[PDB]
Design an enzyme around this catalytic site. Structure first.
Site, PDB file in Angstrom:
ATOM      1  CG  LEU A 227      -2.037  -1.008   1.260  1.00 44.33           C
ATOM      2  CD1 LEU A 227      -2.645  -1.038   2.690  1.00 44.33           C
ATOM      3  CD2 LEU A 227      -3.156  -0.750   0.210  1.00 44.33           C
ATOM      4  CG  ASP A 344      25.329   4.675  -3.576  1.00 39.76           C
ATOM      5  OD1 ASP A 344      24.340   5.034  -4.250  1.00 39.76           O
ATOM      6  OD2 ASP A 344      25.288   3.798  -2.695  1.00 39.76           O
ATOM      7  CD  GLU A 382      18.982   2.723  -3.374  1.00 38.78           C
ATOM      8  OE1 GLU A 382      19.754   3.253  -2.531  1.00 38.78           O
ATOM      9  OE2 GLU A 382      19.242   1.625  -3.964  1.00 38.78           O
ATOM     10  CD  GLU A 391       5.811   3.111   0.144  1.00 38.47           C
ATOM     11  OE1 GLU A 391       4.586   3.186   0.326  1.00 38.47           O
ATOM     12  OE2 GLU A 391       6.423   2.074   0.474  1.00 38.47           O
ATOM     13  CG  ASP A 411      22.133   3.329  -7.269  1.00 40.61           C
ATOM     14  OD1 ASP A 411      23.061   3.979  -6.720  1.00 40.61           O
ATOM     15  OD2 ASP A 411      21.289   2.694  -6.577  1.00 40.61           O
TER      16      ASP A 411
END
Ligand SMILES: *[C@@H]1O[C@H](CO)[C@@H](O[C@@H]2O[C@H](CO)[C@@H](O[C@@H]3O[C@H](CO)[C@@H](O)[C@H](O)[C@@H]3O)[C@H](O)[C@H]2NC(C)=O)[C@H](O)[C@H]1NC(C)=O
Ligand SMILES: *[C@@H]1O[C@H](CO)[C@@H](O[C@@H]2O[C@H](CO)[C@@H](O)[C@H](O)[C@H]2NC(C)=O)[C@H](O)[C@H]1NC(C)=O
Ligand SMILES: *[C@@H]1O[C@H](CO)[C@@H](O[C@@H]2O[C@H](CO)[C@@H](O)[C@H](O)[C@H]2NC(C)=O)[C@H](O)[C@H]1NC(C)=O
Ligand SMILES: *[C@@H]1O[C@H](CO)[C@@H](O[C@@H]2O[C@H](CO)[C@@H](O)[C@H](O)[C@H]2NC(C)=O)[C@H](O)[C@H]1NC(C)=O
Ligand SMILES: *[C@@H]1O[C@H](CO)[C@@H](O[C@@H]2O[C@H](CO)[C@@H](O)[C@H](O)[C@H]2NC(C)=O)[C@H](O)[C@H]1NC(C)=O
Ligand SMILES: *[C@@H]1O[C@H](CO)[C@@H](O)[C@H](O)[C@H]1NC(C)=O
Ligand SMILES: *[C@@H]1O[C@H](CO)[C@@H](O)[C@H](O)[C@H]1NC(C)=O
Ligand SMILES: *[C@@H]1O[C@H](CO)[C@@H](O)[C@H](O)[C@H]1NC(C)=O
Ligand SMILES: *[C@@H]1O[C@H](CO)[C@@H](O)[C@H](O)[C@H]1NC(C)=O
Ligand SMILES: *[C@@H]1O[C@H](CO)[C@@H](O)[C@H](O)[C@H]1NC(C)=O
Ligand SMILES: *[C@@H]1O[C@H](CO)[C@@H](O)[C@H](O)[C@H]1NC(C)=O
Ligand SMILES: *[C@@H]1O[C@H](CO)[C@@H](O)[C@H](O)[C@H]1NC(C)=O
Ligand SMILES: [Ca+2]
Ligand SMILES: [Ca+2]
Ligand SMILES: [Zn+2]
Ligand SMILES: [Zn+2]
Ligand SMILES: [Zn+2]
Ligand SMILES: [Zn+2]
EC number: 3.4.11.-
Lengths: 706, 706
Positions: A227, A344, A382, A391, A411
């Site tokens: 959800l 990163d 992340e 989400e 990424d």
């Protein structure tokens, strides 16, 4: 008047405009301060993205932030996590270092989150130390088999082998009280450990560097499985949450690991458990009487981490398609880091900004509008578990599943500068091959990106001969909910190092306070030509997918993968299966049908390309290509996993390299009696694959054939 | 050169060619012999469909049978099921009738399957008789509350109220050993019971008629939940199958029920439990001393039913679309019956054959080819639980989900000749309204089908004012897996009787050996003009969906349903929810957003219709319309149900007429403490609805808006 198609003049203009200097300056701004998810600096970067993407001259059609309230985890500023060696009465004999040493000028201030294991619980366990290798189930089993009492101990493990939280889960099954994790110099630094041998002198990990990271078992916000975490949402009770490490766990620098491991008492660990800390490794429990510490000494691990609801934003931007605006080519990068995150993910964000500038600028000129919509995404949170991307997929599940051509992820843009490496599902191979053949590699010789790439990562295809290899997609970045939960063909593009010159598991300063701008600028990519190569590759893939009349997705490339998995099953499982009255005959048939139908579809596409087909005819074919990936989803296949529905790419723990549900089920069933529940589940997993492949084939056949 | 659109001349041609006499003759052949699923006669009918649809002058483009091996249930020809009244030592005092009396010349041959409860187990229970009304949980509770010992009893129940198998499930919770089921003349015959009052003298149920039917709890093949029942695929173990009645159960004629119930001892049953068998109904246990039987007598129910794997075929036919062959308008009807099945389903199959003849003939002439593909389906094994349709949806799940515009079902074409009745989801309302306004009702006056229909079944719409009412879809026919599992907008069309003239629960000979051609020819539809009216209505709906450039689906019609469910929740649950810190605020917002977006989409379609839009622009809008139904699916909402994923139309047991997950969760949570798991599940079900509606609204928005 001809339908809009790939325009090679537009492509070359874009490739020629991507500016290494702009990427460099982007990276300088992005990585100047720590930018942990939900921090004030994270919000500054949300506003930077919005500002860039709303610019009237170089921005997109529109851009908006969306925010979710999600459960994150942080250490305490007031009570730092501590690892101490203590005596019989509780007196402290030796303390480990708390955080990175200020070796390069950017560490050690209150802006830098202390090393910690995100989602590991607070507690103050204390006990005799053992060494448990990578903290796999087999590692704790080895200790137990040797008669080592594990109940109440503190177990030291090294990163790698199994996931972060799994080390604590596996420890706790033996009643271990706390876990310590370090990065072994053998695993990341080619065995080097000294200050002069490590950053700022080289790309190697300094002795006080500490990998931070999520120790949650799953991805997505922990409180809202399936959800979206919108303010109002059902949230699982904090008590009913699944997936947290069950015991306190803390990562430490390898200098502190050396002090612990090199003083352990007991049996020599197996050769495969050895490392480069500087001594032979023993197992424990406790310390050796001839070492630095009294043999009655224990290790106290005090952790003060809290779970805390936080707002985390995604930023979305769009260039509306001129012809098929209800088809999306999605390009995403996470924004949040553990510390400065220069590599990163800020190396990717710097590329995201530069590609979106070039395309937005071209859009605002009136020079170009892509055939399909291009959607750009800056994902939040992340580092805590792909939260922002997950989400988003929950909130826009149907709209994305019906409409998304492919998801392109960058990424880390640059792990180092030797070679491209690409991970992706087979439908995306053909377009990245096409793109990389026509861009020059920044390295020596005068090779294309493709011809350099094949020198580093290759495989033999029965169809194409020797080609660059594409890695498979697990859950290492934001492509995970797209491929595993939405069934969208996905790709992840980076430049990386030469495995013949280093065995580093990852670039050495990953997730530490030494992942800084200077690290990239001096060592990984001086000149920023590798960032530019990744920008060009991603830009060319994106424009090929967004502009071409016929989509450049070759679903027939899946055949080699299916056939490979089938062969591994026939070779390694076929006899075991037969012993249990389970036939691979339907699986052979289903793979043959996929092979036949995907080949015939590719021939019908080739035939239609020779004329001037109607837009609707091509739209019908493009739907068969892009929706093929969806046919491998089955939300009932993996009830013990979360979000994994893709029957080709779900996590495999079985030893046979075949369809993962089949491999895992056979592994679990192998020692059970015929007629067991575990054998019935083998048949279920096998029938799930056969049904998925038959249904996939059925979508590739001529659409009005019975 | 204009894009293909609805051609009213073709439509009128088709309306005018549907021939009542051909329909009648179809029905004569279809219902001549009993045609139980998997019987040789069932196979003759498969070959009949194939021959009709492969005819080179009046057939379709192609037609093919597909076969599943599925678990069915049958009584024993060698040991019939028997219900006896027995004395203290086992001597038989009285025997009930075994099967229908040969009252009309078509009953009592070995061709006619004995009345039985399909999937009810073999056994030979014997005990004192009780009367348990409709066999609802509340009915057994009433008996218990009165101090009646239920353990080891035989419970007599009447059809209606709860599903067939549920009577046995509810009985067995109280330790009842066996269940008898009958149809009460009050419930089906307006209180009439004599031979002269019933068929062949009227449409009423004769005293020896017995409703056969599935007593399985779910639909689909019992052995293959969520997987197609193809060769060599996974079947649950017979021992681990869920959904079978736990105790032997047998239906009987109302003449036999009279003999039982009218001799019961004890307390007078409640007023609502009374009926028209001809006596006051008492509860038991056992028989009254002043009646026909000694008061020590028991009822012995001996059942010899077997479970048996059988082959069952579907027959599929197609007319390939000229322009969008990858969009399907699916029209289906089941083929299999309990006995002759003249009304159920052969009246539907007679219409299926005639409509397909008319369209196939037009196709073969070269007169016409529809814009989209029309797929025709003859489903097998529906009487055992929608098995043939469900297995087809499992086998072709993705191809169907991506491409199907709507599913149109005609099971029974004619329950009687008074009025149309239509069930379906809101997006199909506007097209059946359009169709029925332009076809003449066969009844008195000179009314359209629509203006006759509104005289019988109507409702007040805030948008349209008084309009015919569409019934909701549960699991009464083959639309179930289309709407509940695939999320395809679906319709069911029939003609039926006037509820102001009869209170019959269904046409009275339903599922008996009196459902014969003469029953239809003499009573339900003399002259076959109602069959023709249904054929015209279905044909017109089909052509409007298959040929129209813009799809005639109005998703904005969903808004009335959503708002009505919201209002029921606000009125009847809002205070209870508030007392448990659960807000309807996000639900109101989500309903408002759907209302707003669906209306704006309708306005954009209207705007685009005023010009000459590009085919691709219209395809994009048509995708938003047809795929909107899919957005209500959530395969995790109803884990205790099977195949129900649609969060609007799943079974509701709660008293509040709102979203069924919410209604059901509040009804379970109401008698639990604050902070209970049941209250958490209320919030999960509420957030499932909010998320579904927000996602639905998101698909209706302009496709490149953020
Ligand atoms: C709609 O269905 C009704 C019910 O079947 C039809 O009304 C019925 O029509 C039949 C003739 O087909 C009438 O049968 C006659 O009954 C009398 C007894 O009153 C008998 O003496 C004759 O030998 C003959 O069998 C039947 O009475 C009549 N029932 C009623 C209530 O009117 C009606 O015609 C159908 N509508 C259409 C358009 O076909
Ligand atoms: C295929 O990839 C492998 C690397 O995986 C290449 O092998 C390397 O070859 C170079 C030169 O021979 C050496 O630096 C490495 O030591 C090799 N590594 C291994 C593991 O053999 C190989 O050259 C590539 N093939 C082609 C045709 O380019
Ligand atoms: C790829 O990266 C390597 C490693 O940083 C670069 O080689 C270094 O270049 C710096 C100057 O920027 C020298 O000080 C180092 O001695 C070099 N190291 C080695 C091992 O050669 C290399 O130049 C980079 N490639 C490109 C095209 O910039
Ligand atoms: C209900 O009636 C049946 C049928 O007569 C009884 O089943 C028989 O039981 C006897 C024991 O005397 C067996 O030897 C027979 O073979 C059974 N016959 C058949 C035809 O199945 C049954 O016992 C009765 N039930 C109870 C509880 O007494
Ligand atoms: C709306 O439908 C109802 C039936 O549900 C119609 O009401 C019937 O009307 C006729 C004559 O007025 C009678 O035969 C029935 O007894 C009525 N039933 C009820 C429950 O009132 C009503 O006529 C329909 N409305 C319109 C405008 O046609
Ligand atoms: C770390 O080093 C830099 C550069 O020498 C210095 O200016 C800075 O204040 C130091 N940080 C801390 C926290 O002491
Ligand atoms: C570990 O040290 C902490 C911090 O001083 C202390 O509170 C705790 O009790 C110690 N744990 C044990 C088991 O002694
Ligand atoms: C320490 O290690 C040795 C093995 O070298 C063993 O003999 C000894 O008992 C160990 N001490 C303890 C307390 O286990
Ligand atoms: C998230 O933002 C909203 C809106 O500004 C605020 O009211 C809410 O408290 C925030 N949640 C957290 C955890 O900060
Ligand atoms: C039922 O009645 C018909 C018509 O009179 C007769 O021909 C037929 O044989 C009978 N069937 C049986 C099974 O007795
Ligand atoms: C039969 O019914 C009457 C109630 O009218 C009751 O008094 C009597 O006890 C019943 N007989 C038995 C055996 O239950
Ligand atoms: C169904 O048909 C197949 C193919 O003819 C046959 O081999 C199989 O036994 C059949 N199953 C049953 C139950 O008759
Ligand atoms: Ca979530
Ligand atoms: Ca099935
Ligand atoms: Zn990252
Ligand atoms: Zn990271
Ligand atoms: Zn039916
Ligand atoms: Zn039926």
């Amino acid at each position: 008047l001809a339908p809009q198609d790939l325009d090679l003049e537009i492509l070359e203009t874009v490739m020629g405009q991507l500016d290494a200097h702009r990427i460099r300056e982007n990276l300088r701004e992005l990585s100047r301060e720590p930018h942990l998810a939900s921090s004030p600096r994270d919000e500054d970067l949300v506003q930077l993205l919005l500002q860039r993407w709303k610019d009237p001259e170089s921005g997109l059609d529109s851009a908006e932030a969306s925010t979710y309230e999600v459960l994150l985890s942080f250490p305490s500023q007031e009570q730092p996590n501590v690892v101490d060696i203590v005596g019989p009465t509780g007196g402290i004999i030796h303390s480990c270092h708390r955080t990175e040493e200020n070796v390069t000028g950017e560490q050690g201030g209150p802006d830098v989150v202390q090393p910690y294991a995100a989602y590991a619980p607070s507690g103050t366990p204390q006990g005799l130390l053992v060494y448990a290798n990578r903290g796999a189930e087999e590692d704790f089993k080895e200790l137990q088999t040797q008669g080592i009492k594990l109940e109440g101990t503190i177990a030291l493990t090294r990163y790698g082998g199994v996931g972060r939280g799994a080390k604590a889960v596996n420890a706790a099954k033996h009643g271990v009280a706390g876990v310590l994790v370090y990065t072994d110099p053998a695993d990341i630094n080619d065995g080097l450990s000294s200050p002069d041998e490590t950053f700022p002198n080289s790309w190697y990990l300094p002795p006080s560097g500490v990998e931070r990271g999520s120790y949650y078992e799953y991805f997505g916000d922990p409180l809202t499985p399936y959800l979206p975490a919108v303010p109002s949402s059902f949230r699982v009770d904090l008590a009913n949450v699944s997936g947290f490490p069950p015991i306190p766990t803390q990562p430490i620098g390898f200098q502190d690991a050396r002090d612990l491991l090199c003083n352990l008492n007991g049996t020599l660990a197996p050769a495969t458990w050895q490392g480069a800390l500087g001594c032979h490794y023993r197992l424990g429990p406790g310390f050796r009487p001839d070492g630095d510490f009294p043999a009655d000494s224990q290790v106290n691990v005090s952790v003060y981490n809290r779970l805390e609801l936080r707002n985390s934003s995604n930023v979305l931007g769009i260039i509306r398609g001129a012809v098929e605006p209800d088809r999306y080519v999605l390009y995403g990068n996470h924004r949040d880091s553990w510390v400065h995150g220069a590599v990163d993910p800020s190396s990717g964000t710097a590329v995201l900004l530069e590609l979106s500038r070039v395309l937005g600028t071209l859009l605002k000129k009136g020079t170009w509008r892509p055939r399909r919509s291009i959607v750009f995404a800056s994902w939040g949170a992340e580092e805590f578990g792909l939260i922002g991307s997950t989400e988003f997929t929950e909130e826009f599940f149907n709209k994305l599943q019906e409409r998304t051509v492919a998801y392109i992820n960058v990424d880390i843009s640059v792990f180092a500068n030797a070679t491209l490496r690409v991970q992706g599902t087979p439908p995306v191979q053909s377009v990245v091959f096409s793109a990389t053949k026509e861009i020059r590699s920044p390295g020596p010789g005068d090779l294309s990106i493709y011809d350099n790439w094949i020198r580093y990562f290759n495989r033999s295809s029965p169809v194409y001969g020797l080609v660059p290899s594409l890695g498979s997609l697990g859950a290492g970045s934001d492509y995970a909910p797209f491929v595993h939960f939405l069934g969208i063909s996905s790709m992840d593009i980076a430049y990386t190092y030469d495995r013949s010159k280093t065995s580093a598991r990852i670039y050495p300063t990953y997730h530490t306070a030494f992942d800084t701008f200077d690290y990239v600028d001096k060592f990984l990519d001086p000149g920023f030509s590798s960032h530019q190569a990744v920008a060009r590759t991603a830009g060319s893939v994106i424009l090929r997918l967004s502009d071409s009349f016929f989509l450049p997705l070759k679903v027939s490339d899946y055949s080699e993968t299916l056939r490979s998995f089938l062969q591994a099953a026939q070779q390694d499982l076929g006899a075991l299966l037969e012993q249990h009255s389970i036939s691979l005959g339907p699986l052979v048939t289903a793979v043959e049908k996929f092979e036949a139908e995907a080949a015939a579809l590719g021939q019908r596409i080739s035939t239609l390309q020779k004329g001037s087909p109607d837009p609707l005819q091509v739209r019908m074919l493009n739907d068969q290509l892009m929706l093929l990936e969806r046919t491998f989803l089955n939300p009932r296949a993996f009830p013990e996993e979360r979000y994994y529905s893709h029957v080709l790419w779900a996590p495999r723990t079985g030893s046979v390299v075949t369809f993962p549900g089949l491999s895992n089920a056979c592994s679990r069933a192998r020692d059970t009696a015929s007629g067991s529940e575990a054998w019935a589940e083998v048949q279920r997993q096998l029938s799930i694959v056969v049904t998925a492949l038959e249904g996939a084939a059925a979508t590739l056949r001529p659409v009005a054939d019975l």
